[PDB]
């Protein structure tokens, strides 16, 4: 039962902004809900809901700028887009492998962590089966309220305006229910200035080979940060730029291992979202901060040991640490950046991150400083008045539905948020952890009435 | 679409002798074939085939005598009874876990090798859904040819006689097609005599606690062998009998690690059976012998290191090896067994296995010496004449169907063998390796005509 | 060159209080310094310094109450008592093994972490070679200042009074230089009352089998804490008390893995003590708190996974968590302890550790709540006035020598502290990490003038 | 006590042919024996033995042609050149590290297997301390018998003739005792012809970059073999030649893992040589063949998995195996080699190794086919008559001393063999396994009388 197209001029049941892992999980869960074989009920639905997905990328891609060669998953394959909701689903990773004639070969690796490339292709293979309801090259620029009865004081739909990435004109689609699943934006430090030589990690594979077109040149590249991205870049820079001198700049004293130990990893359990959301604001803030080592500013141990083993080989050859080709500079901060000099190389000034150190001259600076999740704020400007009086923060309910004033907004209308709700739903929110079950829940939250007609 | 019962007096399409892993895989594959949602065709079948399973155990059990505490799988969970044929199947291990509310918890172990206890329960959970077509407590004692036209010279069915394990009387069931999937029998050395104190590994958990009813007594137990069973027993004996002196007797000089390395583990691939069967008799004999380290006379490395680490702790405490509580005696053979003495302890005499050594006095002797797969020979005595002239060895075709004289046996009739066909189908034959796909193939081999009516 | 005895009535060069790992390291370093083959200089010393060690234990023991069966080292064998100072030293772990005829056997384990039992024996084997200068069964009860010229205002020696653990009388020994290396004291929570059923982890192997003399009884034991001790106890309780119900009580939500990753593990490097001591008080407090995961409130990953795997087996058997034989209770605190009831079992009342829960009834309560290092404070009461005016905290210099008023105390006299100086010397201070080099430094700090005569 | 030079015209006590790991171990053991601090006796020796080492390499090198980047040890660091004989020795790996200021850094890797580069440097650091008794650039071309009394029928010394690798003239040195420790020679298949494009693995790093001077060219390289060398080359070829197509040709069906499991690894124990030598010729031949998996035709598991994981990534990208950039061709033999064609590429013809397949066109062919140890045979031609009548095979005694006719050869004279004696001393013979203890034994075997004068 493939999801059939809805003409743009028609009132949709659902419009999802973005078609990343989060949205794909919702589409996969809708497919399954409407599948009469996974749901006995689904036989008596017949009428397919009017759903549309808008993605600003040309096709499906999963962090293309960070697809570093050899890079692995930070999560078991069992936490794919379907399995935890229903292992029977056609969209499980194992069934993807089987459909590729590769399942037996994978088994022989004996790994729960597939290559980031392979997993992208898995999520690519899922994405293609919804190409009839996904409009690519469409960047959403704002969501606007609407009224079936213009004279009334009740909002019952939303107009969603999207700029065409190629042609540039704005098209508009009307829906009763809206989902924003747009992921993170590159978070840059404020002290750093704008320069084509200062590049965020998210754009590593895509915009750096353009700048340093010669993989043979003896460049000077620097990497800011101490999380998974910084490590992956720093480690790759050795391989991709064999004659270049690399420098790792971090305010912390060392890269710290990500926590995946079985007892800690319980916070990521799909069922724990209920128990997390139940907790008081002070207890959520206490939990995220305590469990930070599972997600943020941390590196997979095997890569920490790998980076270290390389560093040790440099010692075997040269006892003088200052003479190494690849160097780590712990407890440092960037204070001054000279990027107006005639040469190719900027001049980075460094100080101790503890309460003047060296100076570096670099052709490029990879800034692996993480992501912000406040992008939806810009999209929901025109809909802010629909919240209760006083609300400057969007408040998402358990089912991820933003709180709105019930006297201003019809119950058939509403906006959902997906990816940013870490403060309320837990650390598993921004990741792949619960997407399968979250997708299942979302389909029920949004199409509950419709699916109950057959149930 | 549950498999409905067939009255014993009716002509069956299929009778499987035994309801172990192999038969369960065939039932699981039939279920799936007849499932209209996994097979589009299955909708237009309607009429269920007349199938029956006969098991001599009271209920489903998977090597109960060897369910040693802590004992693990020798195979990935992906090689379960359904996944490699279809990951969508309801009978996959992951879906079993989901149906138990446990899938998320398993993930957190980060293991491809579940506990032998858990996997039994998985295969128990599969087995229960076919209780309507399985007759337990029924030991098959012979399969006999039959003729629809008694005066003709053509055999077109088989009468299968089974002794009731409890009541004792012989019942008979008629089928066109027969499957023998009865697994291995305990292989004992010829030099050893009959004694209730000499026990085969297969009966370790079941018949040893009866003999040594006191888990506190300072017993003397011995273990013969150097394979996975001997190691598991020997290692358990330390834990189950804390005050007893254990002795490991092996003709080889050391326990050798099982080979599960990715390139070697290709022989177990479901697709390789085709390529194996294609090979000449000399090349099959060359392959099994070369790849032996994957299956026979080998121990999982983690358990070799564990047994060794225990042995090292004995050295830390006592430098005198002869004074250890748990001892390994390499390159030894049992020559004389004195089991007629007044005392509780037999007297085992040992010689060098290389071209007189010690003497041991033991309350029990666990003989972990592997299994034979010639049990079907006894069952198929009365059907031997149905083979082509001269044939003293049963010759199984690729689809596991025994070769019979086509002028004596109707094409609607035939006998299949499952588990013993290692000489022709490979090392994966006796194990769980290919059961999912083998079950799929078997259902097609047996019910090909019937399923094509809807196809 | 064995260390010869000094009669108690004679003025010593050195008296060390305690003969644990720290003191043994100092004796080992003195041996080596005086060894003419490890030190070319040592040939022209001839006159051995007058040194004495006072230990309150009957013989050498390394945490006997926590020698849990199977328990391993938290540190590489290379960080033994000699190797990092000089791998040539006779007192290295590898040379200990060689002297036991066991070095080749150890190699075959392929482990950097020996059993806690074996390592004790290693440090026992080192300790015996200094039995001529160690007085066992001697608990030091106070160190007192003395004056060669009683009428003068200059202190130039110390009288060290020790109670005899057996006979009870106080003996006194005079030395110019004093070392306090007494380790930690059991840290108990204030909310808990005194009861023979409430036992600190340090006394687990020694005082619990006395209380619960029946290893067969269905007891109820509880374990407070979430660090390495709590885990080791909790895990052992399963094995040592097979029929007892165990309960783990922790204010944190989960046991967290100890950090031994190569980059973090740099703080433990012998050379880093210099760089640590150099840092400001705010930066030391920032470092210890940030690196806490390496030492405090953490469990070795393999044991976290082991405890978890056991817990998972309980789920396989019983889905009802409340019915498990061994249970973990996260985010709980003990509020009320009823220990005056007629029965064998106390009644523990539990609340949520976050801003009433269950009630437990237990025969014993193992309190694994860590250690305090303020024991020397009691010993140095009579010497407090020797510090500069105002000083209520003992201030240890880099060489671990407590700051004293130079106008009140002769330069030939001084007190050293060993083990408690984490606040000033780093996280490696209380552990085995730097003992080899620290011992080398201490011998130079104390016998510098004497050893320079030959140098 | 450094080993002082002996003028070439003087009668030596010992001449060792070759200065590889084996000889260095003997020099290290002599140093230690003569060290008055490791041997109490050594003080009363005074007179240093007249020893000389002749090496054909310009300086110390340990398999320079196979120093593949990233390549590791196949053996624990504890099995270095000194530790197992005496961990106190100055020449241990740990003490080498300490002398480099690197011991603490190594610890943090947590590895028993150092990089092949680092270990070479360790053995380089040992080698330099014997530069006064090693004559480099000297290839021994024959050992010749001599008689103090030319008219007598008793041989009591040996003249050892060596060609100068640079200048070319033959120099001669006279010794009473001779050691041949020259290692293996490249073993080539007979079917392959002479071509600068056909290169043995031993010359990989040294003679291949000369042939394929462009690391950018899209070459075709092939690798024959399935042992550790073939794997290391094949895996490196991907990294060193990023645009080249690699092909692995092996007569076996898969690369098999080296056995390092604790129980099997007992055959390598220094003490086991005694027990091995004691065994009958049939039992030695049975042991080597059974334990082959520890040394020959085997690959370290981590590299098998690594090669496999790369191969799997090729499947993810292209399902067509024939289109992969790096390919493995199992069960193949080279039958015809066309190396007279005008092009750069030879034409290799392949057949099935089981009782015509593809054709390959290659710029180079790396032949990793192992080593022969019959090089000493050529050197000892002129001394063959000194054996007992009939002897065409050199028979080495337990102490590695070749059997000679006692009526023809004085007891003060004799020849020792080191490295080739696997047939008599075990699998540990050709490796680093027992060198420390073997060196100790050799020094005692050769300088027994001399060292007993002081003992
Ligand atoms: C390099 C990298 C690797 C990671 N790997 C893992 C891992 O191993 N496992 C794991 O659990 N977590 C991982 N994550 C975390 C990751 O954020 C989530 O796993 C997952 O990608 C979240 O998906 P999402 O749909 O919420 O956000 P995204 O993946 O960012 O998807 C959002 C999509 O919406 C589109 N979009 C954005 N703005 C607009 C707009 N205005 N209009 C229309 N479309 C828009 C974007 O193009 C994007 O395709 C990784 C993150 C990074 C950066
Ligand atoms: C202790 C142990 C653990 C193992 N674990 C693994 C593992 O980790 N993974 C793996 O791949 N391989 C394993 N195996 C190998 C094992 O043989 C197969 O995996 C699998 O059990 C084969 O199933 P089967 O149905 O062919 O034989 P069986 O499992 O023996 O099933 C045959 C059934 O038929 C019944 N039966 C026998 N005779 C008769 C009769 N005359 N009439 C009626 N019924 C009869 C028996 O009661 C039995 O239930 C293990 C073997 C042992 C002994
Ligand atoms: C169970 C356990 C295991 C550990 N294992 C490790 C490990 O794996 N590696 C590691 O690096 N760290 C470990 N540690 C940390 C440990 O504290 C140090 O490694 C080491 O024991 C410190 O030695 P110390 O001499 O400073 O203190 P201690 O080991 O406590 O030695 C002090 C000695 O002085 C004696 N003493 C005390 N008071 C007096 C007195 N008044 N008069 C006379 N004598 C006295 C005591 O009896 C004791 O023998 C462990 C700690 C515990 C509790
Ligand atoms: C690539 C590679 C890696 C290895 N790594 C390991 C390992 O991880 N651990 C391990 O235990 N085993 C390893 N080995 C096995 C190795 O053979 C031994 O460990 C060790 O090198 C044996 O030393 P040797 O002195 O007996 O022989 P060699 O190392 O070959 O030393 C012989 C020396 O004598 C010189 N020589 C030769 N002929 C003459 C002549 N006619 N005149 C004068 N001088 C001559 C040679 O130049 C050479 O330097 C490895 C082998 C190879 C090929
Ligand atoms: N071309 C291969 C033949 C080489 C032969 N098997 C040998 O080892 O001599």
mmCIF file of C-alpha atoms in Angstrom, chain B residues 96-304:
data_model
loop_
_atom_site.group_PDB
_atom_site.id
_atom_site.type_symbol
_atom_site.label_atom_id
_atom_site.label_comp_id
_atom_site.label_asym_id
_atom_site.label_seq_id
_atom_site.Cartn_x
_atom_site.Cartn_y
_atom_site.Cartn_z
ATOM 1 C CA UNK B 96 10.276 -13.408 19.877
ATOM 2 C CA UNK B 97 12.044 -10.937 22.178
ATOM 3 C CA UNK B 98 9.573 -8.197 21.248
ATOM 4 C CA UNK B 99 6.677 -10.511 22.038
ATOM 5 C CA UNK B 100 8.277 -11.051 25.467
ATOM 6 C CA UNK B 101 8.811 -7.318 26.142
ATOM 7 C CA UNK B 102 12.564 -7.816 26.227
ATOM 8 C CA UNK B 103 13.994 -6.663 22.877
ATOM 9 C CA UNK B 104 15.326 -3.363 24.235
ATOM 10 C CA UNK B 105 17.015 -5.130 27.159
ATOM 11 C CA UNK B 106 18.774 -7.642 24.916
ATOM 12 C CA UNK B 107 20.189 -4.832 22.757
ATOM 13 C CA UNK B 108 22.007 -3.561 25.890
ATOM 14 C CA UNK B 109 24.000 -6.781 26.274
ATOM 15 C CA UNK B 110 25.667 -6.087 22.912
ATOM 16 C CA UNK B 111 25.975 -9.818 22.154
ATOM 17 C CA UNK B 112 25.302 -11.937 19.066
ATOM 18 C CA UNK B 113 25.416 -15.054 21.263
ATOM 19 C CA UNK B 114 22.382 -15.439 23.588
ATOM 20 C CA UNK B 115 22.344 -17.867 26.534
ATOM 21 C CA UNK B 116 21.545 -21.458 25.550
ATOM 22 C CA UNK B 117 18.622 -21.223 27.994
ATOM 23 C CA UNK B 118 17.103 -18.141 26.341
ATOM 24 C CA UNK B 119 17.478 -19.626 22.849
ATOM 25 C CA UNK B 120 15.739 -22.815 23.964
ATOM 26 C CA UNK B 121 12.853 -20.652 25.175
ATOM 27 C CA UNK B 122 12.836 -18.867 21.818
ATOM 28 C CA UNK B 123 12.550 -22.233 20.054
ATOM 29 C CA UNK B 124 10.003 -23.242 22.723
ATOM 30 C CA UNK B 125 7.905 -20.189 21.871
ATOM 31 C CA UNK B 126 7.999 -21.166 18.207
ATOM 32 C CA UNK B 127 7.188 -24.806 18.986
ATOM 33 C CA UNK B 128 4.005 -24.067 20.945
ATOM 34 C CA UNK B 129 2.317 -22.518 17.890
ATOM 35 C CA UNK B 130 2.398 -25.950 16.236
ATOM 36 C CA UNK B 131 1.074 -27.996 19.179
ATOM 37 C CA UNK B 132 -2.010 -28.921 17.108
ATOM 38 C CA UNK B 133 0.169 -30.813 14.607
ATOM 39 C CA UNK B 134 2.767 -32.202 17.020
ATOM 40 C CA UNK B 135 2.155 -35.445 18.897
ATOM 41 C CA UNK B 136 4.534 -35.547 21.851
ATOM 42 C CA UNK B 137 5.581 -38.650 23.784
ATOM 43 C CA UNK B 138 5.721 -40.537 20.495
ATOM 44 C CA UNK B 139 8.950 -42.349 19.615
ATOM 45 C CA UNK B 140 9.046 -43.538 16.011
ATOM 46 C CA UNK B 141 10.210 -47.160 15.852
ATOM 47 C CA UNK B 142 9.961 -47.819 12.073
ATOM 48 C CA UNK B 143 8.772 -46.476 8.704
ATOM 49 C CA UNK B 144 7.111 -49.083 6.437
ATOM 50 C CA UNK B 145 6.203 -48.943 2.714
ATOM 51 C CA UNK B 146 2.582 -49.230 1.535
ATOM 52 C CA UNK B 147 0.628 -49.662 -1.708
ATOM 53 C CA UNK B 148 -2.743 -48.041 -2.561
ATOM 54 C CA UNK B 149 -3.155 -50.996 -4.884
ATOM 55 C CA UNK B 150 -1.823 -53.918 -2.780
ATOM 56 C CA UNK B 151 -1.595 -56.111 -5.926
ATOM 57 C CA UNK B 152 0.588 -53.584 -7.803
ATOM 58 C CA UNK B 153 4.402 -53.292 -7.606
ATOM 59 C CA UNK B 154 4.380 -49.547 -6.844
ATOM 60 C CA UNK B 155 4.815 -48.017 -3.382
ATOM 61 C CA UNK B 156 2.892 -44.734 -3.010
ATOM 62 C CA UNK B 157 2.736 -44.202 0.770
ATOM 63 C CA UNK B 158 4.455 -44.987 4.075
ATOM 64 C CA UNK B 159 3.089 -46.278 7.366
ATOM 65 C CA UNK B 160 4.986 -44.771 10.301
ATOM 66 C CA UNK B 161 4.824 -46.763 13.556
ATOM 67 C CA UNK B 162 5.516 -45.011 16.866
ATOM 68 C CA UNK B 163 5.797 -46.366 20.418
ATOM 69 C CA UNK B 164 4.120 -44.328 23.164
ATOM 70 C CA UNK B 165 6.818 -43.371 25.681
ATOM 71 C CA UNK B 166 4.375 -43.627 28.603
ATOM 72 C CA UNK B 167 1.675 -46.192 27.790
ATOM 73 C CA UNK B 168 3.887 -48.283 25.477
ATOM 74 C CA UNK B 169 1.530 -49.352 22.669
ATOM 75 C CA UNK B 170 2.377 -48.803 18.993
ATOM 76 C CA UNK B 171 0.241 -46.420 16.917
ATOM 77 C CA UNK B 172 0.469 -46.015 13.127
ATOM 78 C CA UNK B 173 0.089 -43.052 10.754
ATOM 79 C CA UNK B 174 0.052 -43.081 6.937
ATOM 80 C CA UNK B 175 1.738 -40.378 4.829
ATOM 81 C CA UNK B 176 2.927 -39.916 1.249
ATOM 82 C CA UNK B 177 6.078 -38.046 2.336
ATOM 83 C CA UNK B 178 8.364 -38.744 5.320
ATOM 84 C CA UNK B 179 11.007 -36.577 7.022
ATOM 85 C CA UNK B 180 13.596 -37.929 9.458
ATOM 86 C CA UNK B 181 15.039 -35.102 11.568
ATOM 87 C CA UNK B 182 16.125 -36.895 14.741
ATOM 88 C CA UNK B 183 19.568 -35.370 15.375
ATOM 89 C CA UNK B 184 22.509 -37.231 16.886
ATOM 90 C CA UNK B 185 22.900 -40.168 19.259
ATOM 91 C CA UNK B 186 25.431 -40.302 22.102
ATOM 92 C CA UNK B 187 28.716 -41.712 20.761
ATOM 93 C CA UNK B 188 30.507 -43.842 23.341
ATOM 94 C CA UNK B 189 34.033 -45.306 23.109
ATOM 95 C CA UNK B 190 34.104 -49.103 22.674
ATOM 96 C CA UNK B 191 36.774 -49.621 25.361
ATOM 97 C CA UNK B 192 34.504 -48.301 28.113
ATOM 98 C CA UNK B 193 32.017 -50.657 29.816
ATOM 99 C CA UNK B 194 28.407 -50.101 30.942
ATOM 100 C CA UNK B 195 28.150 -48.421 34.340
ATOM 101 C CA UNK B 196 25.674 -45.920 35.885
ATOM 102 C CA UNK B 197 28.839 -44.024 36.889
ATOM 103 C CA UNK B 198 29.904 -43.692 33.246
ATOM 104 C CA UNK B 199 27.637 -40.976 31.816
ATOM 105 C CA UNK B 200 27.621 -39.313 28.393
ATOM 106 C CA UNK B 201 27.687 -35.532 28.272
ATOM 107 C CA UNK B 202 24.197 -35.354 26.707
ATOM 108 C CA UNK B 203 22.824 -36.638 30.040
ATOM 109 C CA UNK B 204 24.900 -34.367 32.340
ATOM 110 C CA UNK B 205 22.206 -32.126 33.863
ATOM 111 C CA UNK B 206 19.650 -34.949 33.920
ATOM 112 C CA UNK B 207 21.331 -38.106 35.277
ATOM 113 C CA UNK B 208 24.370 -36.931 37.291
ATOM 114 C CA UNK B 209 22.572 -35.079 40.144
ATOM 115 C CA UNK B 210 20.682 -38.368 40.642
ATOM 116 C CA UNK B 211 23.950 -40.257 41.184
ATOM 117 C CA UNK B 212 25.798 -37.620 43.224
ATOM 118 C CA UNK B 213 22.815 -36.343 45.252
ATOM 119 C CA UNK B 214 25.142 -34.423 47.609
ATOM 120 C CA UNK B 215 26.583 -31.180 46.172
ATOM 121 C CA UNK B 216 28.745 -30.913 49.318
ATOM 122 C CA UNK B 217 30.612 -34.257 49.149
ATOM 123 C CA UNK B 218 34.321 -34.313 48.226
ATOM 124 C CA UNK B 219 33.753 -36.357 45.046
ATOM 125 C CA UNK B 220 36.143 -37.386 42.293
ATOM 126 C CA UNK B 221 34.678 -36.644 38.867
ATOM 127 C CA UNK B 222 36.455 -37.169 35.549
ATOM 128 C CA UNK B 223 35.684 -35.731 32.096
ATOM 129 C CA UNK B 224 36.735 -37.433 28.862
ATOM 130 C CA UNK B 225 37.111 -35.295 25.732
ATOM 131 C CA UNK B 226 38.456 -31.932 24.584
ATOM 132 C CA UNK B 227 35.502 -30.458 22.669
ATOM 133 C CA UNK B 228 32.938 -27.819 23.675
ATOM 134 C CA UNK B 229 30.991 -30.295 25.848
ATOM 135 C CA UNK B 230 33.978 -31.515 27.880
ATOM 136 C CA UNK B 231 35.058 -27.934 28.572
ATOM 137 C CA UNK B 232 31.557 -26.780 29.583
ATOM 138 C CA UNK B 233 31.162 -29.778 31.925
ATOM 139 C CA UNK B 234 34.667 -29.515 33.412
ATOM 140 C CA UNK B 235 34.185 -25.773 34.014
ATOM 141 C CA UNK B 236 30.740 -26.294 35.533
ATOM 142 C CA UNK B 237 31.930 -29.128 37.818
ATOM 143 C CA UNK B 238 34.010 -26.547 39.683
ATOM 144 C CA UNK B 239 30.889 -24.455 40.381
ATOM 145 C CA UNK B 240 28.301 -27.237 40.915
ATOM 146 C CA UNK B 241 30.604 -29.451 43.028
ATOM 147 C CA UNK B 242 32.704 -26.924 45.068
ATOM 148 C CA UNK B 243 34.552 -29.541 47.148
ATOM 149 C CA UNK B 244 35.122 -32.159 44.458
ATOM 150 C CA UNK B 245 38.331 -32.970 42.615
ATOM 151 C CA UNK B 246 37.930 -32.765 38.834
ATOM 152 C CA UNK B 247 40.106 -34.393 36.175
ATOM 153 C CA UNK B 248 40.064 -33.710 32.429
ATOM 154 C CA UNK B 249 41.245 -36.600 30.243
ATOM 155 C CA UNK B 250 42.066 -35.884 26.587
ATOM 156 C CA UNK B 251 44.036 -37.719 23.877
ATOM 157 C CA UNK B 252 44.978 -34.392 22.300
ATOM 158 C CA UNK B 253 47.618 -32.226 24.004
ATOM 159 C CA UNK B 254 45.355 -29.175 24.450
ATOM 160 C CA UNK B 255 41.863 -27.771 23.887
ATOM 161 C CA UNK B 256 41.816 -25.937 20.547
ATOM 162 C CA UNK B 257 39.722 -22.831 19.747
ATOM 163 C CA UNK B 258 36.672 -23.038 17.498
ATOM 164 C CA UNK B 259 37.154 -21.157 14.230
ATOM 165 C CA UNK B 260 34.524 -18.462 13.676
ATOM 166 C CA UNK B 261 36.742 -16.095 11.656
ATOM 167 C CA UNK B 262 34.815 -14.306 8.859
ATOM 168 C CA UNK B 263 36.504 -15.952 5.849
ATOM 169 C CA UNK B 264 36.308 -19.518 7.173
ATOM 170 C CA UNK B 265 32.710 -18.968 8.341
ATOM 171 C CA UNK B 266 31.655 -18.776 4.674
ATOM 172 C CA UNK B 267 31.218 -22.567 4.482
ATOM 173 C CA UNK B 268 28.176 -22.072 6.727
ATOM 174 C CA UNK B 269 26.458 -19.668 4.292
ATOM 175 C CA UNK B 270 23.048 -21.032 3.131
ATOM 176 C CA UNK B 271 24.067 -20.487 -0.513
ATOM 177 C CA UNK B 272 27.255 -22.545 -0.126
ATOM 178 C CA UNK B 273 25.327 -25.836 0.236
ATOM 179 C CA UNK B 274 24.763 -25.686 -3.547
ATOM 180 C CA UNK B 275 28.500 -25.226 -4.191
ATOM 181 C CA UNK B 276 29.445 -27.878 -1.607
ATOM 182 C CA UNK B 277 27.059 -30.522 -2.995
ATOM 183 C CA UNK B 278 28.475 -29.803 -6.461
ATOM 184 C CA UNK B 279 31.991 -30.804 -5.340
ATOM 185 C CA UNK B 280 33.429 -34.309 -5.835
ATOM 186 C CA UNK B 281 33.509 -36.837 -2.959
ATOM 187 C CA UNK B 282 37.281 -36.365 -2.574
ATOM 188 C CA UNK B 283 36.883 -32.580 -2.380
ATOM 189 C CA UNK B 284 34.081 -32.773 0.208
ATOM 190 C CA UNK B 285 36.228 -35.110 2.327
ATOM 191 C CA UNK B 286 39.090 -32.625 1.887
ATOM 192 C CA UNK B 287 36.887 -29.673 2.912
ATOM 193 C CA UNK B 288 35.302 -31.144 6.061
ATOM 194 C CA UNK B 289 38.714 -32.318 7.318
ATOM 195 C CA UNK B 290 40.306 -28.924 6.610
ATOM 196 C CA UNK B 291 37.458 -26.924 8.178
ATOM 197 C CA UNK B 292 36.993 -29.268 11.175
ATOM 198 C CA UNK B 293 38.225 -26.541 13.577
ATOM 199 C CA UNK B 294 34.924 -24.689 13.037
ATOM 200 C CA UNK B 295 32.762 -27.384 14.624
ATOM 201 C CA UNK B 296 34.299 -30.597 15.989
ATOM 202 C CA UNK B 297 36.724 -31.137 18.899
ATOM 203 C CA UNK B 298 36.930 -27.395 19.556
ATOM 204 C CA UNK B 299 36.104 -24.991 22.393
ATOM 205 C CA UNK B 300 34.954 -21.356 22.343
ATOM 206 C CA UNK B 301 38.048 -19.240 23.051
ATOM 207 C CA UNK B 302 36.517 -17.299 25.974
ATOM 208 C CA UNK B 303 35.964 -20.629 27.771
ATOM 209 C CA UNK B 304 39.504 -21.847 27.000
#
